[PDB]
From a paper:
Protein stability can be rationally improved by optimizing various types of interactions. One strategy is to optimize charge-charge interactions on the protein surface. The electrostatic contribution of an ionizable group to the Gibbs free energy of unfolding can be estimated from the differences between the pKa values in the folded and unfolded states of a protein. charge at 298 K and 333 K were similar, suggesting that the electrostatic contribution of the charged residues to the protein stability is insensitive to temperature changes.
Structural analysis revealed that Arg-8, Arg-21, Arg-42, Arg-54, and Arg-76 are involved in crystal contacts. To reduce the crystallizability of the L30e protein, we created a quintuple variant, 5R→K, by substituting these five arginine residues with lysine. We chose these lysine substitutions because they conserve the surface charges of the L30e protein and because lysines are less likely to form crystal contacts than arginines. Guanidine-induced and thermal denaturation experiments showed that the 5R→K variant has essentially the same Gibbs free energy of unfolding (ΔGu) and melting temperature (Tm) as the wild-type protein. Most importantly, the 5R→K variant was very soluble (>2.6 mM) under the NMR conditions (10 mM sodium citrate/phosphate buffer), and thus we used the 5R→K variant as a pseudo-wild-type, i.e. L30e*, in subsequent NMR experiments. The titration curves for E50 and E62 clearly display biphasic transitions. E50 and E62 are in close proximity in the crystal structure, and thus these observations suggest that the ionization of E50 and E62 may be coupled. To determine the pKa values of E50 and E62, we used the method of global fitting of titration events (GloFTE) developed by Nielsen and co-workers, which allows an estimate of the titration profiles for individual titratable residues.
Author numbering: 0 to 96
The structure:
Amino acid sequence: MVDFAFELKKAQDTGKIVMGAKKSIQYAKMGGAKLIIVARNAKPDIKEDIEYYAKLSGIPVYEFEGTSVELGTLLGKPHTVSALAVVDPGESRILAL
């Protein structure tokens, strides 16, 4: 089993992740990420944008099954985070998602 929270923390600590819908979309447009993670309650059209561009640039996208409050909280942030890009998984096996 993969523990999402453990892997997100491991990737955040030892790799590089970029946070936010707008950056995630931009990374998707550019092919500059290995994985894109979106929250279950991300605005559907934000979710569509990401999927559309990530399919075009060949980036895998994963839906975290929790909300964007929890995603931001997992990341140590006092606000919601509805998506994020894994640019470098670091030591994690997060790209298995």
